[PDB]
Amino acid sequence: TFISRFAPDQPRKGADILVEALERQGVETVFAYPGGASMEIHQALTRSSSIRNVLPRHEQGGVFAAEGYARSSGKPGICIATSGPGATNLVSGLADALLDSVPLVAITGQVPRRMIGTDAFQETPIVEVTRSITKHNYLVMDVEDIPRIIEEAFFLATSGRPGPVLVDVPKDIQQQLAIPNWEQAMRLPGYMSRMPKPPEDSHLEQIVRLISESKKPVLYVGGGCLNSSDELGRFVELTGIPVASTLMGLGSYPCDDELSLHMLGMHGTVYANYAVEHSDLLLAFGVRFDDRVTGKLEAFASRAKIVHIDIDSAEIGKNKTPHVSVCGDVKLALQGMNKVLENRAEELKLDFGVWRNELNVQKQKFPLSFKTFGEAIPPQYAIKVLDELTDGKAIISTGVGQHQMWAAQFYNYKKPRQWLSSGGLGAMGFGLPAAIGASVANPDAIVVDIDGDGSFIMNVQELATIRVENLPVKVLLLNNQHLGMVMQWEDRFYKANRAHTFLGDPAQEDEIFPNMLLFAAACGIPAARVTKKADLREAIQTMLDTPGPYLLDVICPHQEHVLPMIPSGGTFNDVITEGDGR
Amino acid sequence: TFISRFAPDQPRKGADILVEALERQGVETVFAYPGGASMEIHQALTRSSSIRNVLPRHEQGGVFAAEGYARSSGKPGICIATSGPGATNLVSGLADALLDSVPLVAITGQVPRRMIGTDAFQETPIVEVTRSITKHNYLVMDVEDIPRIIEEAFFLATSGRPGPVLVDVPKDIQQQLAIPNWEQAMRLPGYMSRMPKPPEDSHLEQIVRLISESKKPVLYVGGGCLNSSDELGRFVELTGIPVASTLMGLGSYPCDDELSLHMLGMHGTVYANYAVEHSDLLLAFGVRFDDRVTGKLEAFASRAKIVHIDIDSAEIGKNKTPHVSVCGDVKLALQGMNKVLENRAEELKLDFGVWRNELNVQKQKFPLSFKTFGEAIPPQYAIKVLDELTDGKAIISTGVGQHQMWAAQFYNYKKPRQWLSSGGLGAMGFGLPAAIGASVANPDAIVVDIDGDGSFIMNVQELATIRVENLPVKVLLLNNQHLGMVMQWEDRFYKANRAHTFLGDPAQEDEIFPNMLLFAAACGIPAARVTKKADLREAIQTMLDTPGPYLLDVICPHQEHVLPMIPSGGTFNDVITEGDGR
Amino acid sequence: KLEAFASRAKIVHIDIDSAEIGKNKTPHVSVCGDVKLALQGMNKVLENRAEELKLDFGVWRNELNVQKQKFPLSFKTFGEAIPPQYAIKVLDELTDGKAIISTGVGQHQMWAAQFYNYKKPRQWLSSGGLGAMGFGLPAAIGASVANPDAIVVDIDGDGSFIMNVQELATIRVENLPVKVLLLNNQHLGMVMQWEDRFYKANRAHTFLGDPAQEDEIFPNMLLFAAACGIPAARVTKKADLREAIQTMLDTPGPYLLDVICPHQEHVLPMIPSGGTFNDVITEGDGR
Ligand SMILES: Cc1cc2nc3c(=O)[nH]c(=O)nc-3n(C[C@H](O)[C@H](O)[C@H](O)COP(=O)(O)OP(=O)(O)OC[C@H]3O[C@@H](n4cnc5c(N)ncnc54)[C@H](O)[C@@H]3O)c2cc1C
Ligand SMILES: Cc1cc2nc3c(=O)[nH]c(=O)nc-3n(C[C@H](O)[C@H](O)[C@H](O)COP(=O)(O)OP(=O)(O)OC[C@H]3O[C@@H](n4cnc5c(N)ncnc54)[C@H](O)[C@@H]3O)c2cc1C
Ligand SMILES: COc1cnc(OC)n2nc(NS(=O)(=O)c3c(OCC(F)F)cccc3C(F)(F)F)nc12
Ligand SMILES: COc1cnc(OC)n2nc(NS(=O)(=O)c3c(OCC(F)F)cccc3C(F)(F)F)nc12
Ligand SMILES: C/C(NCc1cnc(C)nc1N)=C(/S)CCOP(=O)([O-])OP(=O)([O-])O
Ligand SMILES: C/C(NCc1cnc(C)nc1N)=C(/S)CCOP(=O)([O-])OP(=O)([O-])O
Ligand SMILES: C/C(NCc1cnc(C)nc1N)=C(/S)CCOP(=O)([O-])OP(=O)([O-])O
Ligand SMILES: [K+]
Ligand SMILES: [Mg+2]
Ligand SMILES: [Mg+2]
Ligand SMILES: [Mg+2]
User: Fold this and answer.
1) Is A315 touching B (CB cutoff 8 A)?
2) CA dist., res. B188 & res. B199, Å (int)
């Protein structure tokens, strides 16, 4: 039973109705940056005793923090911005959350209703702008619609395939006095009618039948499995089927487990990609068959019967036509299959030991590898040390680039929602704000942002947010003085012709630039730089043991390349396993 | 006669066609940040010997720098970004350029054509997203359309009412080989048919007639006059009509001149707003009657005959119905009127000396004022000192907030395009990147970013750009540890109830946070902090005299309020002339 | 009701539009491609493994034949009044089921679909998804131009026919041998039927005749045809129906046959909107 700060017969501002609407949704944390059009909302926020605001230093920081909050908790992330320049600063985050299917509710202030469409002060047609990059959005046109729209926004953001919903609120609506009705019905008849029913037995038994008739089965798991760890784990025990994971699915199945093939795809392991290439049964759970994984579609799992379980019917049969499919929650599908597999266990007698041994040979022949040059720090090694010292239990957020791939390759995530990374949109500047949100959502957790120098500086202003909010965010900065991933493609495909990928100062090219230590010092955050591999272990240990925020600048040779690599639109036979920029 | 790096019969990449297309438009500088979808374009850029790239550290920095480049030169600003997160980072800048009518061409890389609309890697429907916040945009669907589209983009961006044009270029188009045709006709029959004809004599004589019959005429000039300084100056000599300017029009008429009423509007001078209030003739040249200027429309110039000259017919009669209007270039209208006024000078005998004296009384009674508390630095004073030491000849860019208004109030701009400020959208983070573009466009000019602490930190990463590019950008940081303008409205209208407007660290609230000096030190930029008014003069002098970039952290009491202030939607009788947060 | 539709079946869906596969119902097996090619592929397999598969659904087929015998398509004959269902059956017989048939929308459309045995595809031309009245006569025009040697008949309703009656002029001028079998019930029949079943027969603007002369056929469609120089006739008695249709077919060039039908007829069977097989209505009319 919810307790309002207002009397049931007492009129109050629309802004106070909106904040209470958030409280009734169970919101405990928002990331709000004030402005003229959203002042009333911020005033109402101070009157709330249950909602905490984390003030960012940039609204892109705000929305990325809401993302990190969401990805690390499974709860909706909430960001708030003013009209115009505030709203437009959210755009990258909205698109990011849509492509990665992250539950997010964004609230934007708007100019008074009568002035909409008149090029007014700080006016942006944000509903128009963000229509194609949100799951849904709203323009609130009456104070009385606030309770319903807020309820629908949270419902849409969190149900089905999760995604961002934006709610645009005119200033005069925030100022209008009214008595809210909290017991109004949502108006989503179309959406509700298309919500998948629980998986039917006929389809699940079809899958179990294929499993018993296969000899080379492979699990292909992704972001859709993040809430299905126990079920998936149970499924693997009952079948003995090896697990290949997408970038978004890392940790759904324990990466340190023997049955784990780790990540597949463009920079996936040789043995994971091998498994899919030679499989006769592909169990695609919570994945969307993106070309970063599949490469050339006709060659992808070309000899396999494909099972696809997705909660979004639009994804099933999009890029590849499955032999068997289930449109529904993979969590429920796993539960259903686990019961069948258990009851018929002594009848099925599942044993893919020969297939598994074939894959273990591939693990031995072509494991993840890196080269150590003198006392220079291998970025791959730095992440391995982090894994060891944190016992693989840390929450890891990243930027985008080489360091992102290495963070995905050389850290064995034991649970889902440890791994926070922009996959679909691949937005630089994501790491630090996402770590902020994750730390607020998980106050007792070890939170580390494994960032690149290009990515880190993009939202470096959020260091101020970290200090002021006293968040124990660790920054493991893999510093190669380059836009590394672009540099790598220049090396492989453009004869190493540099086109604006160097991030240092050419007038002093053998000096580390900028000095990231001083960025941290500016915000009262303790920091250090390590250059020799021998000192790396103690340096990381110091970062972890030092209470509160900490920045470790890890200097790395820039000639490193991410391996293996399947070229764009290529096949498994095109995989590159050696070479760098030396 | 243009000289290509390719033979007329030699096929070459679409990316090389695009870069040459820019060269043929006379482009000398671009602000490009590389990514996968735009790699080919960046490779082609290195093959150009005439185009310089300034690599930003954030694409918002890139587009804001292109804006500063444009606003300070009158040339189109050119920014380039990759697909997805690169493109979405341009959005605030695009909207900003549209609202302030700034000529800008933005080029974005895009996923291969066949993959458009499939939620591909780093894909954003950027043409959809930016349709309502650009003057026009394009999705290039064939390599052969590149020369025409680039020509149309520059034409549309610079002709009529200037604005941003975005061109989206799929990667496969950049890679396609072709032989370009540079002599193809533009396809803009509708736009060209609506281009205003040169002002007719009948309309200009109508205006001169009203001037000779008026006794209290006031000039109301804005951004549309930025290329009409000589003509407007000549016009004022021939008529003796006092000049009131918008935020966007500052410097069109010399602010230090006796006939200058400086800025009108919400934070305009009392005497400027007085003039408009009691005028019987309002000469609105290159303005759009925005409510920041007009307040309550029915009360604005309520007793005046209104003359409106605008190049955009959609602006004429929008918010206020003029008695006389000219749809055309105000530059040409001024030239036409100046000839008439000169030939009939001894016949007209124009003399508004009585009106001017009435306004001078208002200047004496209610001038721009500020209060000095002990040895604390008045932000208003700091700008006045800057004015004196630079002889009012510096290029000034700003952020948004109190410091922006003071930079507009207490600096006497002698020429147009000295003043670079986000007016319509009012985007924080604009100042530093805009100064970057202005410095590149004007290498010999004194360029100063008058920034707020909230605004400055938003794009603080561009300090790296400044050092690497060796730009002599000066930063005058007015530091009040607050989101000042929001704080002011909290004081006036919300009983000083703070709602997330403090930018320092509450755990050490009497320490300056962050330490902006260390942000500068991180990027090898010399810096200093001044706290006492007595030291302020030498500190600013040191900033100016020190070669290269420099940051001056000016500590200001936060209780300062911007005055005068006409409340939102208010009238001249509602003007606030005293009070602060003390 | 989807949940009840084929509720105990494994579903195979072959469609050339991937957006259709898994839209309303999730198939156990699917093929996204040309069904023509899928059939060719399966036919080769079925032929090569014929003696191995030994397919025989004779028991199932017999179960369905019992249903054919118990519940066939049926209609009732009242005195000498013309059953619209019968009129279409006679047309089927006299054209040997080889005619191109276009229709309007309504009761006559359903009867044209129920009581004519189409032997080949593209004989049946009817607006299904949108269900647009006025489609029949112009569609017959296009079909006749495309198929100059074919028997083309527009089985139309009086409401549907008058909507694009102006195309009679097109038919004469272009000299198209378009036959019009007009099933005339003086009503918007299908709407009238739903009024009877679900609104206690409360008429809401479904009568198309003249209330000032309600037992006169209005309008006189014969004169519409005469206006465009098209020979026409009206038949009212079931006994005269056979010769009348024969005359329409044997008369060279365009021809209009106005077939007067009792309006109380209902299209049967009927499964109510969003209903199940257990809800099927097999008897009743507007009498
Ligand atoms: C530089 C870079 C390199 C990359 N290289 C790789 C690589 O080598 N390998 C790789 O894997 N990725 C790589 N990516 C990431 C890639 O672009 C995609 O982000 C990712 O591969 C897609 O993840 P996904 O297939 O699991 O689908 P997701 O984006 O995680 O979407 C989840 C899918 O499951 C469905 N779903 C959601 N919830 C449920 C549920 N409860 N039940 C059933 N279904 C559900 C959703 O509808 C959706 O279809 C890279 C990214 C970058 C930036
Ligand atoms: C915090 C803040 C406070 C502000 N307060 C004020 C204030 O007190 N006073 C104030 O003035 N502004 C203020 N503004 C700015 C305000 O929001 C607008 O940006 C500005 O007032 C509008 O400028 P403008 O009227 O000159 O039109 P512009 O935006 O500069 O547009 C130019 C107009 O002239 C036309 N034009 C362009 N070229 C030509 C040509 N060659 N010939 C003829 N016509 C042409 C265009 O079509 C357009 O209509 C403030 C902004 C902020 C962020
Ligand atoms: C320079 O104008 C503002 C400066 N600082 C502000 O908050 C710290 N505000 N807040 C407002 N609100 S507003 O005046 O009612 C208004 C506005 O005024 C319309 C009024 F007629 F109601 C028009 C467009 C936008 C806004 C906005 F978004 F800023 F709210 N205007 C300013
Ligand atoms: C992880 O993928 C990339 C990493 N780094 C890159 O440049 C440094 N690129 N560049 C690409 N180009 S791409 O592979 O042809 C491609 C792409 O591949 C389609 C291919 F089948 F042609 C699909 C969507 C976007 C892109 C993009 F935008 F990145 F170009 N992909 C990557
Ligand atoms: C430029 C670019 N990608 C294009 C790009 C541009 N801009 C944004 C906002 N996002 C992306 N992904 C990368 S991955 C460079 C990353 O450099 P880094 O942050 O230092 O990481 P690393 O050097 O390890 O590759
Ligand atoms: C929050 C805000 N405005 C809302 C806002 C939010 N976000 C953006 C990107 N732009 C704007 N205009 C202002 S003006 C605060 C400015 O603080 P400041 O940069 O330190 O300048 P000052 O303190 O002088 O007002
Ligand atoms: C009004 C209506 N349907 C709604 C309607 C309205 N308007 C158009 C253009 N199309 C349709 N389908 C029908 S089916 C009445 C048909 O009357 P009819 O042409 O004489 O055929 P019949 O009486 O056999 O049902
Ligand atoms: K930033
Ligand atoms: Mg790097
Ligand atoms: Mg401030
Ligand atoms: Mg009828």
Assistant:
1) no
2) 23
